[PDB]
Amino acid sequence: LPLYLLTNAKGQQMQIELKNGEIIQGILTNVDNWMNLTLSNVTIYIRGTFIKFIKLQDN
Amino acid sequence: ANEALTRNRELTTVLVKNLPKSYNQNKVYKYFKHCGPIIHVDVADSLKKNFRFARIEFARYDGALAAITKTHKVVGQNEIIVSHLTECTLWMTNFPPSYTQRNIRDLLQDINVVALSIRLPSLRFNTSRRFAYIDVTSKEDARYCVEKLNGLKIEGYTLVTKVSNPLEKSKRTDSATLEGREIMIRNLSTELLDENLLRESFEGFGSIEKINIPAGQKEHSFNNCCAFMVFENKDSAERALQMNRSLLGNREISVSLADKKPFLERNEVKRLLASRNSKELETLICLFPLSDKVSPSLICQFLQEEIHINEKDIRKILLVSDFNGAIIIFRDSKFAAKMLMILNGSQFQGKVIRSGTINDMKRYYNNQQ
Amino acid sequence: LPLEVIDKTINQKVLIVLQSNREFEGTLVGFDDFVNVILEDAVEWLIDPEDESRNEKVMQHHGRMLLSGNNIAILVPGG
Amino acid sequence: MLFFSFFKTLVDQEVVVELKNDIEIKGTLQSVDQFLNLKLDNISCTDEKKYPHLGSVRNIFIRGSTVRYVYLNKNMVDTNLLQDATRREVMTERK
Amino acid sequence: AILDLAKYKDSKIRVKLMGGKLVIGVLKGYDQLMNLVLDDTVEYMSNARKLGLTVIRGTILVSLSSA
Amino acid sequence: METPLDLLKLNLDERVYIKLRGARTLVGTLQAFDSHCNIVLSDAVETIYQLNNEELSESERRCEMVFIRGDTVTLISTP
Amino acid sequence: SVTTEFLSDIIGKTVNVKLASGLLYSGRLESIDGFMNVALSSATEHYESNNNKLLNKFNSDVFLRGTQVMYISEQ
Amino acid sequence: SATLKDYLNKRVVIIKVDGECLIASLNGFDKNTNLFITNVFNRKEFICKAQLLRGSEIALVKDTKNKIENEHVIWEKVYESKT
RNA sequence: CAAUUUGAAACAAUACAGAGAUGAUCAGCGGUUCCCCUGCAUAAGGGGAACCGUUUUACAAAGAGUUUUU
Ligand SMILES: [K+]
Ligand SMILES: [K+]
Ligand SMILES: [Mg+2]
Ligand SMILES: [Mg+2]
Ligand SMILES: [Mn+2]
């Protein structure tokens, strides 16, 4: 359910924290099987292995 | 097609007699490959090792024709003879379940017949198949093999040996099921499990040849009983299917055509491979890779004799040839886990085999491709 | 294409930069699919982030080295 | 693999898991997978049960990559079978 | 793939790398594995050094955006 | 007796020495290992080296039978 | 292959093997596999350079995890 | 197999590899232990309702790293102590 | 709806005709992909691997929601 929760939520405002602590916010366009994350409206292509966790918004 | 492909084997296989002691498969290939593409070469020593025989199976009929022009040519200092292999093939069945190609070869060695080729069947679609074609070197030798081996009792099995001709094949003793003449009746009550009542209730459909009632059903006071009924002709079984969902006494019975063992075992394996359960799965292991010619008895003998497993520790052995493997179902998960460890890397039929879970078997197969 | 550049760098000097502050300058002998690199007569550097002058030469290698491509971040042809 | 089979033989045995973060958890091995994740039932911590972060938890799943040691008792292992199995695996050890 | 590097084939991109290093340069080319050819490359460490023409291994790339 | 791992199976049932992440060393009788260098040691003795200020402590653990996750293992030899 | 041919032609030579932690092993390369696991005879252990303080001298073969090997080079 | 089925839609204690806890309810998970949990909070304020935690960062449903002041000093001290 | 466990018993002699084996038993029809061989790096042909659509299922009872070898 994680991966398909990301590809079928193709468009929501999400809050990624990267492993260096370097936080990032924006709207997501595409998710890979590896959980690569392509985004815009940013504070970008992000390698999945470079994610710490993702705070989400909706439900 | 039973005369077509037989005329093709006869048509494209040649026998070479009197090759030099030094001639191996490679040299036979090198000598005959100019005749045409060769599918296979077997070389065997003569009885007294003074010369060699070859069986050469050519790709096309043109190869056999070209090969025969080499008859009576000289190889080394040997005058060779090349001929169509014809009327030189035996069909054998009901040898012991653990007889192997080496074992069959030793049988002919014992009655002094050189065997050029022993061909055993694939167990892909039926695990119980057990027969062999053997090409020998003369029609005389084939008739002698029949004379000495047809009817021989060996290790409890009375061997069947025939000059091979598929047109003369016997009706199997289980032919009624193959032919669609056996119905299975299910969900009878114990009160209804009686051959006379069953003949009376079903004989209107047609002449009944036989009724088989699995034993132990009345004696254990089963809720539901099953019975099998064989009709003399397929039309009778088909009309007997009318009784499905009908009432017999106070029991709604189900009636269907009896399934055959290979179908039933394969659906059992399909259930196993698709399982996401764990009580059943944790009691089994896989062995792989295995030839699709290796039968479950052969694997069982390996578990008892080399690994020293007790016969009553093995619940079931099923082939999974689509992954070059076999499943061994044991009685509990701890024994299964220990067997997984004991068996991995053991040697079977001179080759190292691996053990693992089903996913290990699948991964190994995918990785080899 | 990156790999065509790397291929075209064989027998030239190359600078191999790791994920850490470490680099190896040397003659590129060859590489494989996982971009493991064969270097000839490699200099090994530890690199100071602030001042490239207070960099530290860790060792002078002689002969050939296999540098695992696990850690290879950046390839600079010519050093 | 090998240790997967080893632990499946130790299922229903009481073990002590020491983790990379130094927490030790005594418990009953209930399941294991190809990554050597462990499901321990009825866990209890050793010596320093001082971590009210745990002990009240019925059954825990342990990520195999966070384990440092798994302590067992000699009664629990056939060392002949373990050494022999290793040698058989070892022939097969370039993965 | 997921991020089409072609739109960036002639502009300056910023690329973060696994070990903490940050790199800025003009994207000259790439492959399906996201290996990159960068020109006028400057390398920052965690402090800038100029390196010119370089090849970055796609395996250690952790984030990409426009410069 | 070919890959280094195979040579390690020659040390099975013999006394081994293991250096671990976290300033730690083990000695025990080698019962098992895989290609990740996970290891089962019997009659083991762990030794943790720590820094008390000026540093030098040496604590010790002993155990009958112990699984060791390969990813903490940095080197193996004999005592 | 150039890398495997290299491993082939350093079996038996004295080498330096530096780990990702920066620990450096010198000695005779008894064995290496495709994963760069290493066995070394007559191995010394230094941090970064042979010129630095000696950490261990080994009297039998030392085994090294291929996942931690950063480089192997002729000494 | 050791799956997280039995733990679905239930309150859980999570230990992260950094050595921080989270209390949550796990709606979904994959074979890489990516925790899809809801109603998360520190073991003690709720951080978010609905978040994806990455399997690499799950320790258990200090930190797991054992990096030290590079250790080599300790090893040479240990060497000379046995000399 | 499916998955699991069950009612429950798979008889009838083990065998009883080659990859010439088969029931979607490992199929058929329709379509997509990938690999290998020969071949002019053509074309065209062939033989080894996945996938999607569809065609198919005795009964009852329960019950059922590139991260992991630092
Ligand atoms: K057989
Ligand atoms: K189909
Ligand atoms: Mg039953
Ligand atoms: Mg073409
Ligand atoms: Mn029978």
Short mmCIF file of C-alpha atoms in Angstrom, two decimals, chain B residues 37-353:
data_model
loop_
_atom_site.label_atom_id
_atom_site.label_comp_id
_atom_site.label_asym_id
_atom_site.label_seq_id
_atom_site.Cartn_x
_atom_site.Cartn_y
_atom_site.Cartn_z
CA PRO B 37 23.45 -32.30 -39.45
CA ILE B 38 23.45 -34.81 -36.61
CA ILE B 39 21.02 -34.63 -33.73
CA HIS B 40 22.67 -37.20 -31.50
CA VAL B 41 25.43 -39.77 -31.28
CA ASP B 42 25.66 -42.65 -28.82
CA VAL B 43 28.72 -44.88 -28.80
CA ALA B 44 28.94 -48.18 -26.93
CA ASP B 45 31.57 -50.92 -26.54
CA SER B 46 30.86 -54.34 -28.01
CA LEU B 47 30.25 -57.18 -25.60
CA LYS B 48 33.92 -58.24 -25.62
CA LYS B 49 35.30 -54.68 -26.07
CA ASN B 50 36.98 -55.55 -29.38
CA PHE B 51 35.04 -52.85 -31.30
CA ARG B 52 32.42 -50.19 -30.88
CA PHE B 53 28.85 -49.57 -32.02
CA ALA B 54 27.30 -46.19 -32.74
CA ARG B 55 23.75 -44.97 -32.98
CA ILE B 56 23.60 -41.71 -34.94
CA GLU B 57 20.32 -39.87 -35.08
CA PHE B 58 20.36 -37.46 -38.03
CA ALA B 59 18.46 -34.21 -38.27
CA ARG B 60 16.87 -35.11 -41.59
CA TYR B 61 16.31 -38.19 -43.73
CA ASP B 62 19.04 -36.95 -46.09
CA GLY B 63 21.53 -37.52 -43.30
CA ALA B 64 20.63 -41.18 -42.94
CA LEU B 65 20.83 -41.65 -46.71
CA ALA B 66 24.26 -40.07 -46.93
CA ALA B 67 25.43 -42.02 -43.86
CA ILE B 68 24.52 -45.38 -45.37
CA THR B 69 26.82 -44.80 -48.33
CA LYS B 70 29.62 -45.06 -45.75
CA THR B 71 28.69 -48.71 -45.15
CA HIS B 72 31.65 -51.03 -45.64
CA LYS B 73 34.05 -48.13 -45.77
CA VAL B 74 37.20 -48.53 -43.72
CA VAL B 75 37.81 -46.64 -40.49
CA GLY B 76 41.27 -47.32 -39.17
CA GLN B 77 41.57 -50.97 -40.14
CA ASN B 78 37.96 -51.77 -39.26
CA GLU B 79 35.47 -52.51 -42.03
CA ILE B 80 32.39 -50.78 -40.69
CA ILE B 81 28.76 -51.60 -41.41
CA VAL B 82 26.11 -48.85 -41.51
CA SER B 83 22.41 -49.60 -41.60
CA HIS B 84 19.01 -48.29 -40.75
CA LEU B 85 18.21 -49.21 -37.18
CA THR B 86 14.99 -51.13 -37.75
CA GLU B 87 13.10 -53.75 -35.76
CA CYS B 88 15.80 -53.23 -33.13
CA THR B 89 13.92 -51.32 -30.47
CA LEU B 90 12.30 -52.65 -27.34
CA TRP B 91 9.61 -51.15 -25.17
CA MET B 92 9.80 -52.07 -21.49
CA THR B 93 7.51 -51.21 -18.62
CA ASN B 94 6.85 -52.18 -15.01
CA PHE B 95 10.51 -52.27 -14.12
CA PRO B 96 11.09 -51.34 -10.43
CA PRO B 97 10.29 -47.71 -9.54
CA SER B 98 13.90 -47.01 -8.71
CA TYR B 99 15.46 -48.62 -11.75
CA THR B 100 17.55 -46.05 -13.65
CA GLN B 101 19.09 -45.99 -17.05
CA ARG B 102 22.22 -47.53 -15.51
CA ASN B 103 20.14 -50.31 -13.95
CA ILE B 104 18.40 -51.14 -17.25
CA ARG B 105 21.74 -51.20 -19.01
CA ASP B 106 22.94 -53.68 -16.38
CA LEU B 107 19.92 -55.93 -17.09
CA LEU B 108 20.88 -56.21 -20.74
CA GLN B 109 24.56 -56.66 -19.82
CA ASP B 110 23.42 -59.65 -17.68
CA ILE B 111 21.81 -61.40 -20.70
CA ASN B 112 24.75 -60.28 -22.89
CA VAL B 113 22.90 -57.72 -25.05
CA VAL B 114 24.67 -54.46 -25.82
CA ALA B 115 22.36 -51.47 -25.42
CA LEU B 116 22.91 -48.47 -27.65
CA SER B 117 20.29 -46.16 -26.29
CA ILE B 118 17.92 -46.08 -23.33
CA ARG B 119 15.20 -43.46 -23.50
CA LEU B 120 12.97 -42.72 -20.55
CA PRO B 121 9.92 -40.43 -20.50
CA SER B 122 9.41 -36.94 -19.14
CA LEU B 123 7.36 -36.79 -15.97
CA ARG B 124 6.24 -33.18 -16.60
CA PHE B 125 2.54 -34.00 -17.06
CA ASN B 126 2.33 -37.35 -15.23
CA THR B 127 4.60 -38.23 -12.28
CA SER B 128 3.90 -41.92 -12.40
CA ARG B 129 5.05 -42.65 -15.93
CA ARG B 130 7.49 -45.55 -16.01
CA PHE B 131 8.62 -47.24 -19.25
CA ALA B 132 11.58 -47.17 -21.60
CA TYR B 133 12.59 -47.59 -25.17
CA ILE B 134 15.86 -49.39 -25.67
CA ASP B 135 17.61 -49.57 -28.98
CA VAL B 136 19.79 -52.68 -29.19
CA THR B 137 22.05 -53.80 -31.99
CA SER B 138 20.08 -56.48 -33.79
CA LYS B 139 16.58 -57.76 -34.34
CA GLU B 140 17.91 -61.06 -33.04
CA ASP B 141 19.07 -59.37 -29.85
CA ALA B 142 15.67 -57.64 -29.40
CA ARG B 143 13.83 -60.96 -29.78
CA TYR B 144 16.27 -62.46 -27.28
CA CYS B 145 15.62 -59.66 -24.80
CA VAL B 146 11.91 -60.35 -25.08
CA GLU B 147 12.45 -64.09 -24.67
CA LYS B 148 14.50 -63.63 -21.48
CA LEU B 149 12.90 -60.51 -19.91
CA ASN B 150 9.23 -60.61 -20.76
CA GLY B 151 7.65 -61.98 -17.62
CA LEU B 152 10.80 -61.82 -15.45
CA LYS B 153 10.10 -61.00 -11.78
CA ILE B 154 12.65 -58.46 -10.52
CA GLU B 155 12.69 -56.86 -7.07
CA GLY B 156 8.98 -57.67 -6.92
CA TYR B 157 7.96 -56.28 -10.34
CA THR B 158 7.16 -58.65 -13.21
CA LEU B 159 8.77 -56.87 -16.16
CA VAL B 160 6.99 -56.24 -19.47
CA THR B 161 9.25 -56.40 -22.56
CA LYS B 162 7.94 -56.06 -26.08
CA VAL B 163 9.36 -55.38 -29.49
CA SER B 164 8.37 -51.71 -29.66
CA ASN B 165 5.33 -50.97 -31.72
CA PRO B 166 2.96 -48.33 -30.42
CA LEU B 167 0.14 -49.62 -32.65
CA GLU B 168 -0.17 -52.80 -30.48
CA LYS B 169 -0.50 -50.95 -27.12
CA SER B 170 -2.65 -52.51 -24.30
CA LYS B 171 -5.67 -50.96 -22.59
CA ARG B 172 -4.49 -49.69 -19.26
CA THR B 173 -6.12 -51.27 -16.19
CA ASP B 174 -7.32 -47.72 -15.31
CA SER B 175 -8.61 -47.10 -18.87
CA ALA B 176 -12.18 -46.50 -17.70
CA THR B 177 -11.21 -43.21 -16.11
CA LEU B 178 -9.12 -42.15 -19.13
CA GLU B 179 -12.10 -42.88 -21.41
CA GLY B 180 -14.64 -40.93 -19.38
CA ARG B 181 -16.59 -43.96 -18.17
CA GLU B 182 -16.17 -43.55 -14.39
CA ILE B 183 -18.30 -41.22 -12.37
CA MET B 184 -17.55 -40.21 -8.84
CA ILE B 185 -20.58 -39.93 -6.56
CA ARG B 186 -20.09 -37.69 -3.58
CA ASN B 187 -21.86 -36.82 -0.36
CA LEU B 188 -23.72 -40.08 0.05
CA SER B 189 -24.74 -40.96 3.57
CA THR B 190 -23.41 -44.12 5.21
CA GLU B 191 -26.94 -45.57 4.91
CA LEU B 192 -26.68 -45.16 1.13
CA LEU B 193 -23.13 -46.55 0.74
CA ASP B 194 -24.19 -49.97 -0.58
CA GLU B 195 -23.30 -51.44 -3.95
CA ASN B 196 -26.77 -52.98 -4.56
CA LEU B 197 -28.54 -49.70 -3.93
CA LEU B 198 -26.08 -47.89 -6.21
CA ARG B 199 -26.55 -50.41 -9.05
CA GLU B 200 -30.33 -50.09 -8.66
CA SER B 201 -30.20 -46.26 -8.64
CA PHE B 202 -27.83 -45.81 -11.58
CA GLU B 203 -28.24 -48.83 -13.89
CA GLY B 204 -31.08 -47.10 -15.71
CA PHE B 205 -28.37 -44.87 -17.21
CA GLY B 206 -26.60 -47.86 -18.75
CA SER B 207 -24.89 -51.16 -18.12
CA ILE B 208 -22.69 -50.85 -15.00
CA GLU B 209 -19.30 -52.54 -15.25
CA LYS B 210 -18.00 -51.92 -11.76
CA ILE B 211 -18.58 -50.18 -8.45
CA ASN B 212 -15.65 -49.31 -6.17
CA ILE B 213 -16.31 -48.06 -2.67
CA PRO B 214 -13.30 -46.70 -0.81
CA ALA B 215 -12.96 -48.70 2.37
CA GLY B 216 -13.26 -47.40 5.89
CA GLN B 217 -16.18 -45.03 5.22
CA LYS B 218 -18.95 -46.95 7.02
CA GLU B 219 -16.58 -48.22 9.68
CA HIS B 220 -15.61 -44.69 10.70
CA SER B 221 -19.21 -43.36 10.57
CA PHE B 222 -18.40 -40.58 8.08
CA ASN B 223 -20.86 -37.71 7.56
CA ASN B 224 -20.25 -37.79 3.78
CA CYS B 225 -19.22 -40.77 1.68
CA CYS B 226 -18.02 -41.07 -1.88
CA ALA B 227 -18.22 -43.93 -4.31
CA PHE B 228 -17.02 -44.64 -7.76
CA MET B 229 -19.03 -46.26 -10.51
CA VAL B 230 -17.78 -47.43 -13.92
CA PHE B 231 -20.21 -47.69 -16.84
CA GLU B 232 -19.65 -49.91 -19.86
CA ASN B 233 -19.85 -46.93 -22.23
CA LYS B 234 -19.12 -43.23 -22.05
CA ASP B 235 -22.69 -42.29 -23.01
CA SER B 236 -23.96 -44.00 -19.88
CA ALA B 237 -21.60 -42.01 -17.65
CA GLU B 238 -22.63 -38.80 -19.41
CA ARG B 239 -26.31 -39.41 -18.83
CA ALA B 240 -25.57 -40.48 -15.27
CA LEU B 241 -24.34 -36.99 -14.68
CA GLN B 242 -28.10 -36.10 -14.48
CA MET B 243 -28.04 -37.32 -10.92
CA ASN B 244 -25.95 -34.34 -9.91
CA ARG B 245 -27.80 -32.31 -7.29
CA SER B 246 -30.58 -34.91 -7.37
CA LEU B 247 -31.90 -36.63 -4.25
CA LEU B 248 -30.98 -40.24 -3.52
CA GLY B 249 -32.84 -41.08 -0.33
CA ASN B 250 -32.41 -38.03 1.92
CA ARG B 251 -29.03 -36.96 0.51
CA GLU B 252 -28.47 -34.54 -2.28
CA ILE B 253 -25.60 -36.22 -4.13
CA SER B 254 -23.01 -34.73 -6.48
CA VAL B 255 -21.98 -36.64 -9.57
CA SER B 256 -19.09 -35.79 -11.82
CA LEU B 257 -16.62 -37.47 -14.08
CA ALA B 258 -13.77 -38.88 -12.02
CA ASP B 259 -10.59 -36.87 -12.30
CA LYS B 260 -7.31 -38.51 -13.19
CA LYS B 261 -4.32 -38.63 -10.85
CA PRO B 262 -2.05 -36.30 -12.84
CA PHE B 263 -4.72 -33.66 -12.95
CA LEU B 264 -5.40 -33.97 -9.27
CA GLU B 265 -1.70 -33.87 -8.24
CA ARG B 266 -1.01 -30.89 -10.47
CA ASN B 267 -3.87 -28.85 -9.01
CA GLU B 268 -2.54 -29.77 -5.58
CA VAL B 269 0.85 -28.35 -6.56
CA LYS B 270 -0.78 -25.23 -8.02
CA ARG B 271 -2.51 -24.76 -4.71
CA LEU B 272 0.80 -25.19 -2.97
CA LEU B 273 2.73 -22.73 -5.19
CA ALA B 274 0.04 -20.08 -4.82
CA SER B 275 -0.38 -20.57 -1.08
CA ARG B 276 0.11 -17.63 1.28
CA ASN B 277 -0.77 -19.88 4.25
CA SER B 278 1.88 -21.26 6.60
CA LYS B 279 0.77 -24.35 8.56
CA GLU B 280 1.03 -26.44 5.42
CA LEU B 281 3.93 -24.51 3.85
CA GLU B 282 6.10 -24.66 6.96
CA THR B 283 6.16 -28.47 6.85
CA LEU B 284 7.56 -28.70 3.29
CA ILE B 285 10.83 -28.08 1.51
CA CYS B 286 11.98 -27.94 -2.09
CA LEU B 287 14.79 -29.75 -3.81
CA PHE B 288 16.20 -28.25 -7.01
CA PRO B 289 17.34 -28.37 -9.69
CA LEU B 290 16.25 -31.84 -10.75
CA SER B 291 15.87 -33.42 -14.16
CA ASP B 292 12.33 -33.74 -15.36
CA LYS B 293 13.01 -37.47 -15.74
CA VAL B 294 13.42 -38.14 -11.96
CA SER B 295 10.38 -39.73 -10.40
CA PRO B 296 9.24 -39.27 -6.76
CA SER B 297 10.22 -42.84 -5.86
CA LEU B 298 13.73 -42.09 -6.99
CA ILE B 299 13.79 -39.01 -4.73
CA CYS B 300 12.31 -41.09 -1.84
CA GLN B 301 15.04 -43.72 -2.16
CA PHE B 302 17.56 -40.89 -2.07
CA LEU B 303 16.02 -39.53 1.18
CA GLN B 304 16.05 -42.95 2.86
CA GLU B 305 19.37 -44.34 1.75
CA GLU B 306 21.67 -41.36 1.67
CA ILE B 307 20.04 -39.00 4.12
CA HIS B 308 18.69 -41.77 6.39
CA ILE B 309 15.16 -40.30 6.70
CA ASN B 310 12.52 -42.68 7.98
CA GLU B 311 9.80 -43.52 5.45
CA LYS B 312 7.09 -42.49 7.93
CA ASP B 313 8.55 -39.00 8.32
CA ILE B 314 7.64 -38.21 4.66
CA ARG B 315 4.04 -37.19 4.14
CA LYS B 316 4.13 -36.54 0.37
CA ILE B 317 6.45 -35.94 -2.62
CA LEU B 318 5.23 -33.84 -5.57
CA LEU B 319 7.13 -32.73 -8.70
CA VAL B 320 7.29 -29.04 -9.70
CA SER B 321 9.05 -29.44 -13.00
CA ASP B 322 8.18 -25.94 -14.19
CA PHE B 323 10.90 -24.84 -11.73
CA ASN B 324 13.11 -27.96 -12.21
CA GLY B 325 12.30 -28.97 -8.64
CA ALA B 326 10.33 -31.23 -6.30
CA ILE B 327 8.41 -30.56 -3.07
CA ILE B 328 8.91 -32.85 -0.04
CA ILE B 329 6.17 -32.51 2.59
CA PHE B 330 7.16 -33.74 6.04
CA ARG B 331 5.21 -34.11 9.24
CA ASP B 332 6.20 -30.92 11.12
CA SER B 333 7.97 -27.62 10.55
CA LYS B 334 10.91 -28.36 12.87
CA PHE B 335 11.81 -31.55 11.06
CA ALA B 336 11.28 -29.79 7.80
CA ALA B 337 13.65 -26.99 8.91
CA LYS B 338 16.29 -29.47 9.93
CA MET B 339 15.86 -31.37 6.66
CA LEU B 340 16.24 -28.12 4.78
CA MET B 341 19.58 -27.67 6.45
CA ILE B 342 20.71 -31.35 6.10
CA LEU B 343 19.75 -31.67 2.42
CA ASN B 344 21.26 -28.47 1.01
CA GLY B 345 24.31 -29.24 -1.03
CA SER B 346 23.89 -32.97 -0.76
CA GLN B 347 24.66 -35.04 -3.84
CA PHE B 348 21.93 -36.68 -5.89
CA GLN B 349 22.63 -38.75 -9.02
CA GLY B 350 26.18 -37.44 -8.94
CA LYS B 351 25.22 -33.77 -9.00
CA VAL B 352 24.91 -31.33 -6.18
CA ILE B 353 21.33 -30.33 -5.38
#
